Design a protein around this ligand. Structure first.
Ligand SMILES: [Mg+2]
Ligand SMILES: [Mg+2]
Ligand SMILES: [Mg+2]
Ligand SMILES: [Mg+2]
Ligand SMILES: [Mg+2]
Ligand SMILES: [Mg+2]
Ligand SMILES: [Mg+2]
Ligand SMILES: [Mg+2]
Ligand SMILES: [Mg+2]
Ligand SMILES: [Mg+2]
Ligand SMILES: [Mg+2]
Ligand SMILES: [Mg+2]
Ligand SMILES: [Mg+2]
Ligand SMILES: [Mg+2]
Ligand SMILES: [Mg+2]
Ligand SMILES: [Mg+2]
Ligand SMILES: [Mg+2]
Ligand SMILES: [Mg+2]
Ligand SMILES: [Mg+2]
Ligand SMILES: [Mg+2]
Ligand SMILES: [Mg+2]
Ligand SMILES: [Mg+2]
Ligand SMILES: [Mg+2]
Ligand SMILES: [Mg+2]
Ligand SMILES: [Mg+2]
Ligand SMILES: [Mg+2]
Ligand SMILES: [Mg+2]
Ligand SMILES: [Mg+2]
Ligand SMILES: [Mg+2]
Ligand SMILES: [Mg+2]
Ligand SMILES: [Mg+2]
Ligand SMILES: [Mg+2]
Ligand SMILES: [Mg+2]
Ligand SMILES: [Mg+2]
Ligand SMILES: [Mg+2]
Ligand SMILES: [Mg+2]
Ligand SMILES: [Mg+2]
Ligand SMILES: [Mg+2]
Ligand SMILES: [Mg+2]
Ligand SMILES: [Mg+2]
Ligand SMILES: [Mg+2]
Ligand SMILES: [Mg+2]
Ligand SMILES: [Mg+2]
Ligand SMILES: [Mg+2]
Ligand SMILES: [Mg+2]
Ligand SMILES: [Mg+2]
Ligand SMILES: [Mg+2]
Ligand SMILES: [Mg+2]
Ligand SMILES: [Mg+2]
Ligand SMILES: [Mg+2]
Ligand SMILES: [Mg+2]
Ligand SMILES: [Mg+2]
Ligand SMILES: [Mg+2]
Ligand SMILES: [Mg+2]
Ligand SMILES: [Mg+2]
Ligand SMILES: [Mg+2]
Ligand SMILES: [Mg+2]
Ligand SMILES: [Mg+2]
Ligand SMILES: [Mg+2]
Ligand SMILES: [Mg+2]
Ligand SMILES: [Mg+2]
Ligand SMILES: [Mg+2]
Ligand SMILES: [Mg+2]
Ligand SMILES: [Mg+2]
Ligand SMILES: [Mg+2]
Ligand SMILES: [Mg+2]
Ligand SMILES: [Mg+2]
Ligand SMILES: [Mg+2]
Ligand SMILES: [Mg+2]
Ligand SMILES: [Mg+2]
Ligand SMILES: [Mg+2]
Ligand SMILES: [Mg+2]
Ligand SMILES: [Mg+2]
Ligand SMILES: [Mg+2]
Ligand SMILES: [Mg+2]
Ligand SMILES: [Mg+2]
Ligand SMILES: [Mg+2]
Ligand SMILES: [Mg+2]
Ligand SMILES: [Mg+2]
Ligand SMILES: [Mg+2]
Ligand SMILES: [Mg+2]
Ligand SMILES: [Mg+2]
Ligand SMILES: [Mg+2]
Ligand SMILES: [Mg+2]
Ligand SMILES: [Mg+2]
Ligand SMILES: [Mg+2]
Ligand SMILES: [Mg+2]
Ligand SMILES: [Mg+2]
Ligand SMILES: [Mg+2]
Ligand SMILES: [Mg+2]
Ligand SMILES: [Mg+2]
Ligand SMILES: [Mg+2]
Ligand SMILES: [Mg+2]
Ligand SMILES: [Mg+2]
Ligand SMILES: [Mg+2]
Ligand SMILES: [Mg+2]
Ligand SMILES: [Mg+2]
Ligand SMILES: [Mg+2]
Ligand SMILES: [Mg+2]
Ligand SMILES: [Zn+2]
Lengths: 77, 91, 112, 50, 252, 63
RNA sequence: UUCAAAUGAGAACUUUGAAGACUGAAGUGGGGAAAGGUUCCACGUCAACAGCAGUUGGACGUGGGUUAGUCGAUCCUAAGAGAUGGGGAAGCUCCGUUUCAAAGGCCUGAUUUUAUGCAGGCCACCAUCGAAAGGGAAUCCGGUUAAGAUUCCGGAACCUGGAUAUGGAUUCUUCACGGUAACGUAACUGAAUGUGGAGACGUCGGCGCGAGCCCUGGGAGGAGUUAUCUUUUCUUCUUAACAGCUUAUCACCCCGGAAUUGGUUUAUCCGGAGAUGGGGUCUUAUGGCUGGAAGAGGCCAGCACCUUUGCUGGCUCCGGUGCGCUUGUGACGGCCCGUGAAAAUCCACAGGAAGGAAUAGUUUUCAUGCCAGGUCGUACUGAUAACCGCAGCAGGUCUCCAAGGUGAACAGCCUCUAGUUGAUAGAAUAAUGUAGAUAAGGGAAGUCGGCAAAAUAGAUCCGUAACUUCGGGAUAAGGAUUGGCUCUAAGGGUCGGGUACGAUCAACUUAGAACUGGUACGGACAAGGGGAAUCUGACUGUCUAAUUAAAACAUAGCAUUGCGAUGGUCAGAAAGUGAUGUUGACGCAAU
RNA sequence: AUGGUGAACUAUGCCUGAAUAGGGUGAAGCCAGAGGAAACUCUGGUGGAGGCUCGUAGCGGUUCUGACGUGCAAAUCGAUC
């Protein structure tokens, strides 16, 4: 039910006690006028609401994904 | 562009009821709908709504009054002789 | 062309049975039931909607942060600020002109 | 009548159950004297008066 | 024969008051220590239409002298009284429109409303839009006060009978032609089921003492004895005269 | 096709008319149309200065 | 209504395909209330039943089927109903509902023999039943079944109660800062008692805005027509609760001090009790963008195979218009001798009892965290066959949703979606009929009587008598005109212009002019006959369900009567009983 | 005569709900204009009043003294109202 955009705050969810699941989504999408780019949403499933974090830039997106806690159970796509 | 020769507001009633009852009704209607001066802020904004209740558009004071007019002959003559009698008991 | 149906068993157009037509992700039209509209709380002194205060149906007010239920100044979300000014001034003056009445009838009781 | 009381649903229930033909083995009993179900009932022939 | 109509009305069936909307019942304050050793201030906080009534009521709230809180009364609004006005009620209260004073404490000629037949009956006399009583003198031993009621009648009551100074609001109400059936319809809609009225003379004999005959007519004198029995009194009961009142009335 | 021929002003004659001129398009609607436009022509000229505020105000109650 | 097939011993009547029609969104469409009670659905199946038939059925036989913290009930109060101390009554029972009554229960402290005796203050509120349309804590989308779904599945929420810790906030100036102010905020102790709000409320009118619908351009797909013509005709292009940010007519605040009065609505209201102006504050209906959410749904293409049935790709985009239609809402205005419920329940404020830190306290109206949500209803019909009328009766029976054209239009007539194509059948077409029509010349001569029937009819323009309560009579009467097609003129929005105009975008209305036809044109549908008088009731309204709708009843208006409560009139067997009466003569009662 | 049962129809009151195409008319209030020595009179607009009106649905039930009159129907059906 929620959108997040502080990448720092975000990571703190993924390591928040009750967070068992998390899912990455990938969207083909177009940029401004011409070409397209590859948008990715990070959805952490909280006990009470689903936080999701858009990261347009793939460059950020890549690194971000390793950061994902190695006990968190991620559904890829 | 003088719209009706003589039936004024009472022209809604058409031909019904007979001239004389309309004549009577017209008098008190003209009375009851019309806007009056406020004895409190001075703005002619007192209008009616249910017999005997007169309220002020702005300033919102509400006075009790006549069934179709703000002050009634009788009441005011009473107001005056209440003055009178009260004057006797400080003088 | 697409028509629609009530969603509750009640078949009549009562206040508590308002409908709203709405387009779903399925691509169809579905009824929806619309709760009565809330109304604004009112000043005790004068009677106008008092600003700063959120307008919910009465029980919904207990599901909402206290700041939604007041403004700061005294008689917060209860009288309309202008109307508080009224009763501050009046309070002052009458407490004052109360002193005046006192030393004056003390003067009456003094010399007479 | 489409949104019923339990008491009424139940009479209702019980009455579904009594709606059967004679169980044909009764016929074989010694002295058995019942031929058909004489108290059978149909929804559009006889109303239950609740 | 049938039970006629005026008999039926008494068992209150379709015949009782239509009262869902009424504002409460108007009466004066209880005759407590304040109001009867001094005076006690209230404010008229709003004056308001009472349903099926002619005159407006005025909600008038007071302090409770005995425990901390407010108690509110419902008054019949005299003419001229207005929201925000202060109201003074007591023996030692003063003589202005809207206050309420024992008929003992007001000079002859004073004009009051909602006056008590007995002290603290919280008001009985003159309440209808427009009406009022006038004090026409008082004999100060056995402290009576004589008044003239709106009927013309002259009663003497206790001097401690309370009354409120002025005349009841909404006067003139009856001056205006009802005009159509409907207006009267809606009028009784908020009173009782008394309208419309079938003439007995148009009923059959089962129905009325006026019923039947091959032309419509009363058939015998329609002035009926006081001593008549239920079923007999329809017409001019106990009529001590009858016919077009020639000449000026006005009680001598 | 027809709707075109309409908006090219056709089949709009006294013999293709069945509701009163009034019903087809209300007298009042016209008034509000017209009057709102005068009222707002006025406003721009004032809020600009082509008209002076006094001249405006006469034209207002004049319109 | 029709052709064929299929099934079957048997087919006008069942199933499937085709064809011809109908209902025409005020439905023969899609759901419900009452009532029914299994009629729902599957399989089997024709002795009765379905006034021909029958292989079919609401029939028979046999089974299956109705899943909820959020939908209702359940709670609350309405008119009313009705226990209780009492009072009547031989008694069955009648009266009273806070009434003449010693009417009862909460907060916590005191217990540290223990669990609740007493230590304060309160509160004197006075049963209970009564709404599946009134009030009311909280749920949505997708999917799925032979038959259930806001109830299951998937996903995403929210409410109420209970527990509670972690983070934040707060405090050495203890119980927050900021803004001139309106007011701001993630929080920001608050008992008794008091008070305010919300719940909570008429009706009609135009005006403003939302939603869905309707209309429409481009593009990307699929379908249809193509002798000829059509950059065509048809169709898909969707986005829920909930959540973040944003968004408002109204209202309000600061600056300022107005006659040459200004501002201003379609509708004349507002200003020295401070207008216009400039700047701000607020409600968040509503809308936008984002999260939910493309992963769903929608539309295609490309391979796969008895099979479960898959697999793989795409595309799902950008706009325009308005006295449109339904609804919703707002700021206003009209009307009243009519002024248009209640209670539960929720919040707030006034108050300040109390309790609480620097060696460490206070805080769950801030965030995040754990648990729990019982009982009964849930199937289908809702009617020319699931209800009531002896029945599968042309009757009766409360409601929501509502497309295109013509046209004023929810009219009639035609159509899209959906649904039906049920009503014994065949052959003939005498009399007499019932329903639908036409008739030369005459025109009420018919007849009790113009009964029936015919005539009239829309709109635009012209024209309009007596009489009158001056409002009417009036569409009085009487007239002309009306198609197609081709032009002309008139009526609008959007911008920039130092402190005259030009540029584009989008709408049917009205009037005028040509041409044109077997003089036709409201071309079907739709749609007033008029006039002069007499009798009679003023009018609108009312009644004999099933032979009387009238001149009868009612009504406003007029006039008479009774009554100041220890009362008038009326109720009861009685009464500490009742109606009027939540009343008071501008009233109630009776003519 | 005695003791009982009925307001599911219908009559009337109360409570709480719901429902009613599209037209004609143009009452108060308001704005601008005209005349007149004066008093005052007049015009064009705006606005949207009524137990008003034309007419659907609705509610009713006038006439055919139509159909039916062992009915579809123990009150129905058609047209007209
Ligand atoms: Mg379409
Ligand atoms: Mg349902
Ligand atoms: Mg606030
Ligand atoms: Mg707020
Ligand atoms: Mg039956
Ligand atoms: Mg039976
Ligand atoms: Mg008798
Ligand atoms: Mg009563
Ligand atoms: Mg009556
Ligand atoms: Mg009478
Ligand atoms: Mg009378
Ligand atoms: Mg009468
Ligand atoms: Mg008679
Ligand atoms: Mg007699
Ligand atoms: Mg008799
Ligand atoms: Mg007689
Ligand atoms: Mg007579
Ligand atoms: Mg007009
Ligand atoms: Mg307009
Ligand atoms: Mg404009
Ligand atoms: Mg002006
Ligand atoms: Mg057949
Ligand atoms: Mg058709
Ligand atoms: Mg139709
Ligand atoms: Mg059918
Ligand atoms: Mg159903
Ligand atoms: Mg049934
Ligand atoms: Mg079946
Ligand atoms: Mg057989
Ligand atoms: Mg059968
Ligand atoms: Mg048969
Ligand atoms: Mg057979
Ligand atoms: Mg069976
Ligand atoms: Mg079964
Ligand atoms: Mg609920
Ligand atoms: Mg319960
Ligand atoms: Mg009792
Ligand atoms: Mg209850
Ligand atoms: Mg309920
Ligand atoms: Mg309800
Ligand atoms: Mg579904
Ligand atoms: Mg299942
Ligand atoms: Mg179903
Ligand atoms: Mg679920
Ligand atoms: Mg979940
Ligand atoms: Mg909780
Ligand atoms: Mg802070
Ligand atoms: Mg309260
Ligand atoms: Mg309140
Ligand atoms: Mg209500
Ligand atoms: Mg919701
Ligand atoms: Mg501003
Ligand atoms: Mg500022
Ligand atoms: Mg509607
Ligand atoms: Mg009101
Ligand atoms: Mg509140
Ligand atoms: Mg203490
Ligand atoms: Mg909390
Ligand atoms: Mg169902
Ligand atoms: Mg059926
Ligand atoms: Mg039937
Ligand atoms: Mg059907
Ligand atoms: Mg038949
Ligand atoms: Mg035949
Ligand atoms: Mg002939
Ligand atoms: Mg002739
Ligand atoms: Mg002749
Ligand atoms: Mg002859
Ligand atoms: Mg003759
Ligand atoms: Mg004759
Ligand atoms: Mg003759
Ligand atoms: Mg005829
Ligand atoms: Mg002819
Ligand atoms: Mg005439
Ligand atoms: Mg021509
Ligand atoms: Mg042009
Ligand atoms: Mg004659
Ligand atoms: Mg008549
Ligand atoms: Mg009859
Ligand atoms: Mg009879
Ligand atoms: Mg009649
Ligand atoms: Mg008849
Ligand atoms: Mg007369
Ligand atoms: Mg006694
Ligand atoms: Mg009944
Ligand atoms: Mg309504
Ligand atoms: Mg209408
Ligand atoms: Mg017309
Ligand atoms: Mg109309
Ligand atoms: Mg001049
Ligand atoms: Mg109108
Ligand atoms: Mg009428
Ligand atoms: Mg009419
Ligand atoms: Mg018409
Ligand atoms: Mg009727
Ligand atoms: Mg008939
Ligand atoms: Mg006949
Ligand atoms: Mg026959
Ligand atoms: Mg008709
Ligand atoms: Zn004032």
């Amino acid at each position: 039910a929620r959108e997040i955009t502080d990448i720092k705050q975000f990571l703190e969810l993924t390591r928040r006690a009750d967070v068992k699941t998390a899912t990455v989504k990938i969207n083909k999408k177009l940029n401004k006028a011409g070409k397209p780019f590859r948008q990715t949403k990070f959805k952490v499933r909280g006990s009470s609401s689903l936080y999701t974090l858009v990261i347009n830039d793939a460059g950020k997106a890549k690194k971000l994904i390793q950061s994902l806690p190695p006990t968190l159970k991620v559904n890829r796509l | 562009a003088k719209r009706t020769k003589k039936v004024g507001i009472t022209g809604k009633y058409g031909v019904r009821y007979g001239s004389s009852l309309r004549r009577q009704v017209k008098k008190l209607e003209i009375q009851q709908h019309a806007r009056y001066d406020c004895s409190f802020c001075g703005k002619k904004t007192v209008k009616r709504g249910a017999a005997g209740i007169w309220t002020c558009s702005c300033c919102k004071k509400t006075v009790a009054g006549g069934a179709y007019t703000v002050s009634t002959a009788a009441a005011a003559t009473v107001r005056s002789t209440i003055r009178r009698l009260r004057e006797m008991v400080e003088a | 062309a697409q028509r629609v149906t009530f969603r509750r068993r009640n078949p009549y157009n009562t206040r508590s049975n308002k409908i709203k037509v709405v387009k779903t992700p399925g691509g169809i039209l579905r009824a929806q039931h619309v709760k009565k509209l809330a109304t604004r709380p009112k000043c005790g002194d004068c009677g106008s909607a008092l600003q700063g205060i959120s307008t919910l149906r009465p029980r919904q007010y207990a599901t909402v942060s206290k700041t939604h239920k007041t403004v700061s100044r005294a008689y917060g979300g209860s009288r309309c600020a202008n109307c508080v000014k009224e009763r501050i001034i009046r309070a002052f003056l009458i407490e004052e002109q109360k002193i005046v009445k006192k030393v004056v009838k003390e003067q009456t009781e003094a010399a007479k | 009548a489409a949104q019923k009381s339990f008491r009424i649903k139940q009479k209702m229930a019980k009455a579904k159950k009594q709606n059967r033909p004679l169980p044909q083995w009764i016929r074989l009993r010694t002295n058995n004297t019942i031929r058909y179900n004489a108290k059978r009932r149909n929804w559009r022939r006889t109303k239950m008066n609740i | 024969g049938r039970v006629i109509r005026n008999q039926r009305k008494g068992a209150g069936s379709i015949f009782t008051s239509h009262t869902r909307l009424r504002q409460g019942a108007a009466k004066l304050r209880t005759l407590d220590y304040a109001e009867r050793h001094g005076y006690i201030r209230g404010i008229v906080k709003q004056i308001v239409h009472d349903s099926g009534r002619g005159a407006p009521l005025a909600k008038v709230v007071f302090r409770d002298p005995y425990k901390y809180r407010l108690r509110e009364e419902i008054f019949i609004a005299n003419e001229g009284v207005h929201t925000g006005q202060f109201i003074y009620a007591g023996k030692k209260a003063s003589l202005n429109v809207g206050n309420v004073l024992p008929l003992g404490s007001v000079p002859e000629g004073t004009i009051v409303s909602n006056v008590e037949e007995k002290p603290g009956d919280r008001g009985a006399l003159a309440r209808a839009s427009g009406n009022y009583v006038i004090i026409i003198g008082h004999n100060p031993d056995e402290n009576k006060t004589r008044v003239r009621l709106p009927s013309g009648a002259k009663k003497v009551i206790s001097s401690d009978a309370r009354g409120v100074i002025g005349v009841i609001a909404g006067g003139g109400r009856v001056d205006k032609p009802l005009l159509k059936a409907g207006r009267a319809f809606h009028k009784y809609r908020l009173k009782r089921n008394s309208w419309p009225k079938t003439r007995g003379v148009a009923m059959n004999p089962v129905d009325h003492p006026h019923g039947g005959g091959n032309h419509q007519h009363i058939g015998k004198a329609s002035t009926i004895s006081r001593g008549a029995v239920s079923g007999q009194k329809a017409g001019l009961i106990a009529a001590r005269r009858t016919g077009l009142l020639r000449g000026s009335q006005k009680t001598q | 096709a027809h709707a075109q021929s309409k908006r090219e002003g056709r089949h709009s004659g006294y013999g293709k008319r069945k509701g009163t001129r009034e019903a087809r398009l209300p007298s009042q609607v016209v008034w509000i149309r017209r009057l709102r436009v005068l009222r707002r022509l006025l406003a721009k000229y004032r809020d600009a200065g082509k008209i002076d505020k006094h001249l405006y105000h006469v034209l207002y109650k004049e319109s």
